[PDB]
Symmetry: C3
Subunit: 114 residues, 3 copies
């Protein structure tokens, strides 16, 4: 499926990976290899964190198809109910289906907030 | 000359070349070196073939300023009338002058369907 | 601060740097390293100088956080009043605050006409 939301600009980070910034819905696309795990985050219109800031947090590398303890799902000695689909995604309302662009780069993959 | 059609997003393929996807007119820009032969194709809104799919067909490399036997012009033991300008381009109606963006990347070069 | 102007396409030059062409206000984003000096120029709608042209003049490298004798400020044996903020920027009207996108890539850095 698809929708009518492809108004965003594509950018690159440093000299390795690349991420696109949504100048409207406030979304970003970040992923290691092509056709792999993806991640979406929110941005501020008062100060859009261009690649300059992105590369800063990206350098720390707290995902790599692993997802550090950033979200509510640390993935290490946790109760039954976890995050991702029960913590960082309140039903379909989750910011996972609010942009076609991100669906292209990420490849309609299950991305989680970072 | 130019027109009023620059609504598209630019993307990259793998870690070598890059191609832009037109989220409207359904067009794509693909080329080897800067200022060289170009190629335009159509895309589906139901499932836009992001770089993921592009790199797949691009990996096969069936052009390289040569154009394989993909189109109606195999370029090898064929009748008089050929393609390109007499097979893969029905007059000006050809999808060669329906986007300014592609005209920039391709460099207003005679691109043929792949 | 920010505004409502993010309608532009991002492109890359050669195989090192990258620049975004503003298909409207006629502006381009050029800079060496991420989060460093930036440069903005005007383009023509009749013949948008794609990366092909950019790389041409860019190859000469007449800036590098130095700015050659291109503008009115050669930076070498010149009168009191110089350019940049007194030659290549007529008050706030200067083409430095006419695009949010450029402000992102450049990082709200002081750019000078090249």
């Amino acid at each position: 499926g698809s929708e009518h939301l492809v108004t965003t600009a594509t950018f690159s980070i440093g000299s390795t990976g690349l991420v696109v910034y949504d100048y409207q819905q406030l979304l970003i696309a970040y992923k290691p290899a092509p056709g792999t795990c993806c991640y979406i985050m929110k941005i501020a219109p008062e100060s859009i964190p261009s690649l300059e800031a992105l590369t800063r947090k990206v350098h720390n590398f707290q995902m790599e198809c692993s997802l550090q303890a950033k979200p509510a799902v640390p993935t290490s000695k946790l109760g039954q109910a976890e995050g991702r689909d029960a913590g960082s995604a309140p039903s379909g309302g989750d910011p996972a289906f609010l942009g076609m662009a991100v669906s292209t780069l990420c490849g309609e993959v299950p991305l989680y907030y970072i």
